[PDB]
Amino acid sequence: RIFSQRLRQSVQHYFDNPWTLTVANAERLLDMRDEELALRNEEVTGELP
Amino acid sequence: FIAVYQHLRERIRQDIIRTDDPVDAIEQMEIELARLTEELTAREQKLAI
Amino acid sequence: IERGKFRSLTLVNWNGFFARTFDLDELVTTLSGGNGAGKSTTMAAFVTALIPDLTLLHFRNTTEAGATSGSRDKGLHGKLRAGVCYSTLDVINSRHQRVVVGVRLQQVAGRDRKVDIKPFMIQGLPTAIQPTQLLTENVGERQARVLP
Amino acid sequence: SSTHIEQFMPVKLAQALANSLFPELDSQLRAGRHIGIDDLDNHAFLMDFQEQLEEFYARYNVELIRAPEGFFYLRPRSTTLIPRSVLSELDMMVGKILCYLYLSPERLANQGIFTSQELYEELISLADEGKLMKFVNQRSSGSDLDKQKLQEKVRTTLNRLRRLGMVYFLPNNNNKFTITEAVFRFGADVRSGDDPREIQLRMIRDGEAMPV
Amino acid sequence: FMPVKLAQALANSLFPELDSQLRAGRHIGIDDLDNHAFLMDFQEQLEEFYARYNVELIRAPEGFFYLRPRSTTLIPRSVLSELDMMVGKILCYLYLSPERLANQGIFTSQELYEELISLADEGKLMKFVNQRSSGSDLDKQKLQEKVRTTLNRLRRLGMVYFLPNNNNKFTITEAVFRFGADVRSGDDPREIQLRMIR
Numbered sequence A: 001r002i003f004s005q006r007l008r009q010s011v012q013h014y015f016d017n018p019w020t021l022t023v024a025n026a027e028r029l030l031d032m033r034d035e036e037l038a039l040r041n042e043e044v045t046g047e048l049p
Numbered sequence B: 001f002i003a004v005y006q007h008l009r010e011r012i013r014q015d016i017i018r019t020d021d022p023v024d025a026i027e028q029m030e031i032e033l034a035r036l037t038e039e040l041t042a043r044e045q046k047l048a049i
Numbered sequence C: 001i002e003r004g005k006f007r008s009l010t011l012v013n014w015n016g017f018f019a020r021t022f023d024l025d026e027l028v029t030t031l032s033g034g035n036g037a038g039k040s041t042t043m044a045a046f047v048t049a050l051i052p053d054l055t056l057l058h059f060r061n062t063t064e065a066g067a068t069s070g071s072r073d074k075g076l077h078g079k080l081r082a083g084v085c086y087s088t089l090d091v092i093n094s095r096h097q098r099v100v101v102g103v104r105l106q107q108v109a110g111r112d113r114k115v116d117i118k119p120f121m122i123q124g125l126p127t128a129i130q131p132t133q134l135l136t137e138n139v140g141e142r143q144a145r146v147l148p
Numbered sequence D: 001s002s003t004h005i006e007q008f009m010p011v012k013l014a015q016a017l018a019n020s021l022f023p024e025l026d027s028q029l030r031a032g033r034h035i036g037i038d039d040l041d042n043h044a045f046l047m048d049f050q051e052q053l054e055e056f057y058a059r060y061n062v063e064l065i066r067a068p069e070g071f072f073y074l075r076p077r078s079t080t081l082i083p084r085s086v087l088s089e090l091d092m093m094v095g096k097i098l099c100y101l102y103l104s105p106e107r108l109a110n111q112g113i114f115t116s117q118e119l120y121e122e123l124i125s126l127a128d129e130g131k132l133m134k135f136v137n138q139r140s141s142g143s144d145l146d147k148q149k150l151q152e153k154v155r156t157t158l159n160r161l162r163r164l165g166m167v168y169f170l171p172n173n174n175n176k177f178t179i180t181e182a183v184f185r186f187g188a189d190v191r192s193g194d195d196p197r198e199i200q201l202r203m204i205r206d207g208e209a210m211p212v
Numbered sequence E: 001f002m003p004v005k006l007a008q009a010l011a012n013s014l015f016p017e018l019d020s021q022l023r024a025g026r027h028i029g030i031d032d033l034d035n036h037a038f039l040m041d042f043q044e045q046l047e048e049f050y051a052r053y054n055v056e057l058i059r060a061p062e063g064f065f066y067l068r069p070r071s072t073t074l075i076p077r078s079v080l081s082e083l084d085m086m087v088g089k090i091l092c093y094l095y096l097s098p099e100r101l102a103n104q105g106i107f108t109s110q111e112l113y114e115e116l117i118s119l120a121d122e123g124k125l126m127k128f129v130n131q132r133s134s135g136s137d138l139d140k141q142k143l144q145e146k147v148r149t150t151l152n153r154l155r156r157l158g159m160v161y162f163l164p165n166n167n168n169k170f171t172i173t174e175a176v177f178r179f180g181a182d183v184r185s186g187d188d189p190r191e192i193q194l195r196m197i198r
């Protein structure tokens, strides 16, 4: 009967001393937004062997 | 000395071991150790077959 | 049992080849010609048509063989011309079925020298049809055009 | 002799960095994920080379820490080379409730599988429902639309805690999940029966927690 | 084991910092003397080190280094906004020949603001701020704010260096070429850059 009182009172009265934990939050790797793929179209022609 | 005790008090693992008295905690830990050893013995016996 | 065989390889609008078809041999096929003629290019076209995974394809020079280089350029883009391109294989199955696998290749407009691949397969094609003619349209006086 | 690994690096550290598990783990760790006992591969790896990893990461001005419960995590210093961030108060409410749920022997029979509804029911049983509703919307007074909005925010924050490694969803059902020991960090303000103010001061001094 | 030169490279005191930067997406140009020299010296091994993350270490033909993630990247990815590429292509255009005589390499925020407003079409500007907007002062103020914001993002990427004072005047680095057009034999850079901007 040790933690019941210990933890319940903390949740019940949290807003009298609100506190927050710290975490590692390394940056995301920025990349180019992919534009719509634009292929090369040229209607090539030539003499057939 | 007080500092030492204070230091240690935080380091308790979970509820069944929440004896706020470190020295008292020791034995509980060791109890766990023995428990675990028995479970390991049974599991390795199962593994053989 | 009769093992399957590769009948032929076809290239369209590659660097130096407009529309060419090599007929493979049952045992050995040899390519000869002076430096820069285009032999290694033919090899590259074949392997590309076999494994279109663009993450893997990496055509190093024969010199510098075996050196894991991570080169900026994989060396495929330059072997293609502007517009649409093809690379196809004709295969005779052990069941004596004619199947044509291949890929459509196309350069990507933009600073990065990227390439686009779209595989395809054809089954049941009549034995009288040649891939060179199937992939081109006769426009004008013997001045054929390639079709997407 | 020259051109010898020992000149530049301890052999065990190089051996660790060359392992196939390292890139995954590194990536994750940097992202803030906690590592518990269930993900054996990772955990075991951590255990094997603990001191080398600690020494390594030290270069970055970050502590690789081991909680008593057996879970590893990253704590950045003030001079950290890697950014540091803080959790929201709703995340704390859900965190402390998940902690009480883990301890509860009354629900141990579930074999760790809990449902979002049970979590929500426990939370409203303990905290001030109508006063907590203030965080969802400044005009909330017990309306069902607002109650569903609260449930959806809980659903969202719980998903964030999953990315942190604090809870694992079932393989085929997303309405049910399992807890891990990493949740005990939410009890860092009460694990010792002492003056709350002094505890809080100690925590902020250690870099564990910030006020709001 | 591990290659000796790779162990040497990552043992160097400069590595942690550069690692941090690179993972963020920053581009290393010829300006950063020590970092650039370090990469030049240990490229052959750093490329292998980062390949283990399914991320590619590329040296641009102009000379600057940067990382490119694959689809299977181990590093969490993120993507720029449309307005970001618009501004980037504008900066690429400003890397012009008369620039040398016009500004001696040092620009101002107003140059970019006015260039952006003059050269872009109104429809995509509205799409940038909000479709409900129509030629109003508050919309232009919001667009200015967004321009400053994205310019700071680009400064993070290393594209643009702010002169060390509170005022918003800057210089453009060579790495801006990453936004640039494809170059074909004999083509004029101004024309091709404008052609894409259109």
Ligand SMILES: Nc1ncnc2c1ncn2[C@@H]1O[C@H](COP(=O)(O)OP(=O)(O)OP(=O)(O)O)[C@@H](O)[C@H]1O
Pocket: C015, C033, C034, C035, C036, C037, C038, C039, C040, C041, C042, C075, C076, C077, C078, C079
């Ligand atoms: N990626 C490329 N970009 C530009 N030109 C290329 C590219 N790859 C090959 N070439 C050129 O295409 C021509 C054909 O080269 P290829 O290697 O296929 O010839 P080859 O007959 O096999 O020569 P060798 O026997 O000397 O290897 C050569 O002029 C080569 O310079």
Ligand SMILES: [Mg+2]
Pocket: C036, C038, C039, C040, C041
């Ligand atoms: Mg060759």
